[PDB]
Ligand binder design. Structure first.
Ligand SMILES: *C(=O)[C@H](CCSC)NC=O
Ligand SMILES: [Mg+2]
Ligand SMILES: [Mg+2]
Ligand SMILES: [Mg+2]
Ligand SMILES: [Mg+2]
Ligand SMILES: [Mg+2]
Ligand SMILES: [Mg+2]
Ligand SMILES: [Mg+2]
Ligand SMILES: [Mg+2]
Ligand SMILES: [Mg+2]
Ligand SMILES: [Mg+2]
Ligand SMILES: [Mg+2]
Ligand SMILES: [Mg+2]
Ligand SMILES: [Mg+2]
Ligand SMILES: [Mg+2]
Ligand SMILES: [Mg+2]
Ligand SMILES: [Mg+2]
Ligand SMILES: [Mg+2]
Ligand SMILES: [Mg+2]
Ligand SMILES: [Mg+2]
Ligand SMILES: [Mg+2]
Ligand SMILES: [Mg+2]
Ligand SMILES: [Mg+2]
Ligand SMILES: [Mg+2]
Ligand SMILES: [Mg+2]
Ligand SMILES: [Mg+2]
Ligand SMILES: [Mg+2]
Ligand SMILES: [Mg+2]
Ligand SMILES: [Mg+2]
Ligand SMILES: [Mg+2]
Ligand SMILES: [Mg+2]
Ligand SMILES: [Mg+2]
Ligand SMILES: [Mg+2]
Ligand SMILES: [Mg+2]
Ligand SMILES: [Mg+2]
Ligand SMILES: [Mg+2]
Ligand SMILES: [Mg+2]
Ligand SMILES: [Mg+2]
Ligand SMILES: [Mg+2]
Ligand SMILES: [Mg+2]
Ligand SMILES: [Mg+2]
Ligand SMILES: [Mg+2]
Ligand SMILES: [Mg+2]
Ligand SMILES: [Mg+2]
Ligand SMILES: [Mg+2]
Ligand SMILES: [Mg+2]
Ligand SMILES: [Mg+2]
Ligand SMILES: [Mg+2]
Ligand SMILES: [Mg+2]
Ligand SMILES: [Mg+2]
Ligand SMILES: [Mg+2]
Ligand SMILES: [Mg+2]
Ligand SMILES: [Mg+2]
Ligand SMILES: [Mg+2]
Ligand SMILES: [Mg+2]
Ligand SMILES: [Mg+2]
Ligand SMILES: [Mg+2]
Ligand SMILES: [Mg+2]
Ligand SMILES: [Mg+2]
Ligand SMILES: [Mg+2]
Ligand SMILES: [Mg+2]
Ligand SMILES: [Mg+2]
Ligand SMILES: [Mg+2]
Ligand SMILES: [Mg+2]
Ligand SMILES: [Mg+2]
Ligand SMILES: [Mg+2]
Ligand SMILES: [Mg+2]
Ligand SMILES: [Mg+2]
Ligand SMILES: [Mg+2]
Ligand SMILES: [Mg+2]
Ligand SMILES: [Mg+2]
Ligand SMILES: [Mg+2]
Ligand SMILES: [Mg+2]
Ligand SMILES: [Mg+2]
Ligand SMILES: [Mg+2]
Ligand SMILES: [Mg+2]
Ligand SMILES: [Mg+2]
Ligand SMILES: [Mg+2]
Ligand SMILES: [Mg+2]
Ligand SMILES: [Mg+2]
Ligand SMILES: [Mg+2]
Ligand SMILES: [Mg+2]
Ligand SMILES: [Mg+2]
Ligand SMILES: [Mg+2]
Ligand SMILES: [Mg+2]
Ligand SMILES: [Mg+2]
Ligand SMILES: [Mg+2]
Ligand SMILES: [Mg+2]
Ligand SMILES: [Mg+2]
Ligand SMILES: [Mg+2]
Ligand SMILES: [Mg+2]
Ligand SMILES: [Mg+2]
Ligand SMILES: [Mg+2]
Ligand SMILES: [Mg+2]
Ligand SMILES: [Mg+2]
Lengths: 51, 76, 96, 63
RNA sequence: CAUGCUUGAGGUUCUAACUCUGGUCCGUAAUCCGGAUCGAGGACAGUGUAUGGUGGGCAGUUUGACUGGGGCGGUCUCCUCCUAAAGAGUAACGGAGGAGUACGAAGGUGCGCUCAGACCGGUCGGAAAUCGGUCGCAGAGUAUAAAGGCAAAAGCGCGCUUGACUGCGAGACAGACACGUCGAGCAGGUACGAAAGUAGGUCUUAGUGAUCCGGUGGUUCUGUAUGGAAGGGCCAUCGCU
RNA sequence: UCGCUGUGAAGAUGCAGUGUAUCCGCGGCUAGACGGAAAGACCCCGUGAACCUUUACUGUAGCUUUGCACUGGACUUUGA
RNA sequence: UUAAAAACACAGCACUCUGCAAACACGAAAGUGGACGUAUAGGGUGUGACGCCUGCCCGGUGCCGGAAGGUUAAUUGAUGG
RNA sequence: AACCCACUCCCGUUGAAAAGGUAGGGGAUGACUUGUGGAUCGGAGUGAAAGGCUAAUCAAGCUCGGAGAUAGCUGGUUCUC
RNA sequence: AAUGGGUCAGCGACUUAUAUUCAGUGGCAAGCUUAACCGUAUAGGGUAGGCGUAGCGAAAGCGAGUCUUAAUAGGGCGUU
């Protein structure tokens, strides 16, 4: 089953997104570009642990 | 008996009929699929909902090829 | 609060906020109440000589309501910007 | 003697000049599967419904 | 490593604590009880307190509803069709089927293209593979049931990509409440395209669970003499067949 | 304070139609007055009660393990 | 005070516990019964004169014995934050 | 036979009697019957065991208190327009 | 032919205290009113306290505005 993850911004701010993924089929970490409200720019987000 | 199931009713159908006055943002028809297609001044939602982008009068005309049915808004 | 066994409102919704104990020593005074002290000096102890504030109040602020009656001087009492002009306009000196 | 207000009602409804405020439900957990629009519109505080004022006031001993 | 300094653990021994429902003296004229003295045991036993195990010996309680009586059997939340009487809604232990997910591309955008099937010819396959031609117009397809849709294809392929964005939100639909559904537009930053433009997930409708409590990341709030902290609040998120 | 056939909260002395019948006792018999007696014991219901059972839940008397106190001396083995 | 029986008791049989301040029972305890008894004795359990007999199973749950190993309480408090 | 008991039939059932009577019936030197005095009791006693008995009361006596327990259940609720 | 009542006479069931909301009727009025208590004792005093004259915010706080927000944009609540 799909397991929850967290996407945390490359900026020093603690802002994060949340989603889920297929850990068995896609093992590589998700490296997405999203909008950071705190700094107000589009930056890079990286996977972490939802727990 | 192995049958006792059903689902709640969704209240679909025509909300504003022909000749009626619409305000922008009003919901016109609730659908599954596009039984009515959006005409002038009418937009389509992401669940095939017809709403109003302008003010005026409901028209309800069928026209064009393919024999479709169109909901539009005309000046009152 | 009973509803027949259905979950009632006072247990269906979340609790929110906290109670500020800082505001329990606070009082607010209209500008229309300022022309009721004995003479020309609006202080904390003079507002208690009338019944404008309780005996447990330590901080007082003046808001704009009504009209100022005379020319009073405020001793260590805060005021808003609208009340600052209203008090000052009618010769009311403001100090401390 | 004196009427005792319900403790749990006073923590969830706050009295204002515009009625009684309260927060929204369905915002405690299970929040990844929710839409951002749905969570954004459950964020503020709102007024009690006209059909709940009587039964809530009677819990707060206001009527 | 003899050696000195303390502590952990076991074994034996001694008497002096404690024990005797053992003998003889006295109180006393007394199978109680004390005191004295002999004998035995001996730092064990036993009691207080803290703690693990066992414990129907004893106790306070729980053990759902629907239902052509109750039990047994079956069901209980959500989606699609009929019943349902051409607006909505509408019951039965009425007639039929599905859900408790999937997808970082199966999402966005620009460009490009049309299926199933039949017949004819063609090297081994041969009724049916791959190939060429004619006919066909949707009898195909749609991640997943059924209904309603589908040429600007919502179907199929490729390049680039992250709008599966943040704050809102005129106005509506539904509705006992709590929840639910659609959304033009405005402001920030973006992605495709020469541009007009399109994009706030997927053709639409199932894929779900209130509060309390507790954990994790931030915070212009509070912080019981004061300065901090603990704790609390707010915002984001996690844990319920 | 009659019978019958119908009607009717569906088995009538009392309602409809009709037939019978002067007024009142006494000795007898029990077919009806859904006759008297006991707020049905059977059945179901009540977020009722008791008492009984057990590997239902949560406790508990008793029994049992160890730490500390009452509680000491010497030798010996052994560890830091 | 609707059941006198095929029910209960019984002599006989077996298992088991108990070394005496006995096991066991009543008592917050002192104490008392067992017993002024001492394993040919005392308590519990089942079967039920007498005759012939009483077969196989120790996997489950109890009880008895074992102590190597695995887990395991109060207590103590290395180390880190 | 006395004495103790209660197997059968009938009567009685508003009884002579809130468990009897008339006819028959069982034991009758014993694990017998009986008088007087004494001991054990309410989650307790006693029981050759029937859930039996503990003052005509027993799957937990009687009495006084908590107490006007609680009763989503029956019944009743009084003059006029 | 479901309950209750043989009949009479007498008794027999929406009360009281304290907190509070709405309406009617009064006193004062941007103010109204006192509680314990004192008392020449239903007077008079006693205005500690309660409600009103200002809201918004979870709060610090700001105030005819405030909160959300990067936003004097929108929107919620409030104001003659
Ligand atoms: C059933 O037959 C019922 C109760 C009998 S006793 C179980 N009849 C009563 O008359
Ligand atoms: Mg059915
Ligand atoms: Mg069905
Ligand atoms: Mg239906
Ligand atoms: Mg859209
Ligand atoms: Mg429930
Ligand atoms: Mg005052
Ligand atoms: Mg409270
Ligand atoms: Mg939620
Ligand atoms: Mg939150
Ligand atoms: Mg003894
Ligand atoms: Mg002695
Ligand atoms: Mg002695
Ligand atoms: Mg000695
Ligand atoms: Mg010892
Ligand atoms: Mg010990
Ligand atoms: Mg002990
Ligand atoms: Mg018990
Ligand atoms: Mg029990
Ligand atoms: Mg138990
Ligand atoms: Mg209890
Ligand atoms: Mg109880
Ligand atoms: Mg119970
Ligand atoms: Mg339960
Ligand atoms: Mg039932
Ligand atoms: Mg029926
Ligand atoms: Mg039937
Ligand atoms: Mg049935
Ligand atoms: Mg069943
Ligand atoms: Mg119709
Ligand atoms: Mg219809
Ligand atoms: Mg209905
Ligand atoms: Mg199913
Ligand atoms: Mg698709
Ligand atoms: Mg071909
Ligand atoms: Mg086309
Ligand atoms: Mg409507
Ligand atoms: Mg460009
Ligand atoms: Mg809880
Ligand atoms: Mg302090
Ligand atoms: Mg401090
Ligand atoms: Mg903190
Ligand atoms: Mg009839
Ligand atoms: Mg009649
Ligand atoms: Mg008849
Ligand atoms: Mg007749
Ligand atoms: Mg009559
Ligand atoms: Mg008649
Ligand atoms: Mg007649
Ligand atoms: Mg007779
Ligand atoms: Mg008769
Ligand atoms: Mg009868
Ligand atoms: Mg009764
Ligand atoms: Mg009854
Ligand atoms: Mg119930
Ligand atoms: Mg019980
Ligand atoms: Mg213990
Ligand atoms: Mg000990
Ligand atoms: Mg006999
Ligand atoms: Mg017997
Ligand atoms: Mg024996
Ligand atoms: Mg036997
Ligand atoms: Mg036998
Ligand atoms: Mg075994
Ligand atoms: Mg074995
Ligand atoms: Mg063992
Ligand atoms: Mg006699
Ligand atoms: Mg007898
Ligand atoms: Mg008999
Ligand atoms: Mg007899
Ligand atoms: Mg005879
Ligand atoms: Mg005889
Ligand atoms: Mg006789
Ligand atoms: Mg004989
Ligand atoms: Mg006696
Ligand atoms: Mg006694
Ligand atoms: Mg008792
Ligand atoms: Mg029995
Ligand atoms: Mg008994
Ligand atoms: Mg008796
Ligand atoms: Mg009882
Ligand atoms: Mg009693
Ligand atoms: Mg009573
Ligand atoms: Mg009571
Ligand atoms: Mg009545
Ligand atoms: Mg009258
Ligand atoms: Mg009659
Ligand atoms: Mg009846
Ligand atoms: Mg009647
Ligand atoms: Mg009745
Ligand atoms: Mg009845
Ligand atoms: Mg009667
Ligand atoms: Mg009034
Ligand atoms: Mg008035
Ligand atoms: Mg505003």
């Amino acid at each position: 089953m799909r397991e929850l993850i967290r996407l945390v911004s490359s900026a020093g701010t603690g802002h994060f997104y949340t989603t889920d993924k297929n850990k068995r089929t896609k093992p590589e970490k998700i490296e997405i570009k999203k909008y950071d409200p705190v700094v107000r720019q589009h930056v890079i987000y990286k996977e972490a642990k939802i727990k | 008996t192995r049958n006792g199931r059903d689902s709640e009713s969704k209240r679909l159908g025509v909300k504003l009929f022909g000749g009626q006055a619409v305000k922008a943002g009003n919901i016109l028809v609730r659908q599954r699929g596009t039984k009515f297609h959006a005409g002038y001044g009418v937009g389509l939602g992401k669940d095939h909902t017809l709403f109003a982008k302008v003010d005026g009068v409901v028209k309800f005309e069928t026209k064009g090829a393919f024999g479709r049915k169109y909901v539009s808004i005309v000046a009152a | 609060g009973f509803e027949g066994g259905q979950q009632p409102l006072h247990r269906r919704l979340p609790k929110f906020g906290f109670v500020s104990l800082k505001a329990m020593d606070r009082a607010e005074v209209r500008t229309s109440e300022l022309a009721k002290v004995e003479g020309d000096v609006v202080s904390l102890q003079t507002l208690k000589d009338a019944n404008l504030i309780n005996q447990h109040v330590q901080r007082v602020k003046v808001m704009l309501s009504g009209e100022v009656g005379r020319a009073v001087t405020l001793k260590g009492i805060a005021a808003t910007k609208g009340a600052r002009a209203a008090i000052e306009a009618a010769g009311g000196k403001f100090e401390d | 003697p004196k009427m005792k207000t319900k403790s749990g009602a006073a923590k969830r409804f706050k009295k204002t000049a515009g009625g009684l405020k309260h927060k929204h439900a369905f915002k405690s957990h299970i929040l990844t599967k929710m839409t951002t629009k749905r969570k954004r519109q459950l964020r503020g505080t709102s007024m009690l419904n006209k059909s709940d004022v009587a039964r809530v006031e009677r819990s707060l001993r206001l009527r």
